[PDB]
Design a protein around this ligand. Structure first.
Ligand code: DYZ
Length: 127
């Protein structure tokens, strides 16, 4: 029932890049999802205490959320786009595993995911 430490968002010894695909992930993908009306549950790590989800971290071993991804993008955490695309996919998967089909949180994730898949379809060519 306690919250774990958050996912890592700073590591000076992790090598990094700034790249046109990573810039697209921030300016197009993250921004598009973040401004959506259903973003709010996904904008920060799950607070299992606040939300009364005492089993959440027993089930979900690789937590991920858009607050973390926004910090990873803004803090230049990544080496490549794959890593950031994987974070989005982990966030959606976690929601589909934890919750019941058709629960409001699930519909919310499916709506975000639709937009995510469209933007990823459109990923720019690597410069
Ligand atoms: C996506 C992470 N997350 C944030 N809040 C959540 C969840 C979750 O997986 N399951 C949940 O039950 N809630 C609570 C919640 C349900 C419905 C709408 C809003 C918040």
């Amino acid at each position: 029932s306690m919250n774990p430490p958050p996912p890592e968002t700073s590591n000076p010894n992790k090598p990094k890049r700034q790249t046109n695909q990573l810039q697209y992930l921030l300016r197009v993908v993250l921004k598009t999802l973040w401004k959506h009306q259903f973003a709010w549950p996904f904008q920060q790590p799950v607070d299992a205490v606040k939300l009364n989800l005492p089993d959440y971290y027993k089930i979900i071993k690789t937590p991920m959320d858009m607050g973390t991804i926004k910090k990873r993008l803004e803090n230049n955490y990544y080496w490549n786009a794959q890593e950031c695309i994987q974070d989005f996919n982990t966030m959606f998967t976690n929601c589909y595993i934890y919750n019941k089909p058709g629960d409001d949180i699930v519909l919310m994730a499916e709506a975000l995911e639709k937009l995510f898949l469209q933007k990823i379809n459109e990923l720019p060519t690597e410069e």
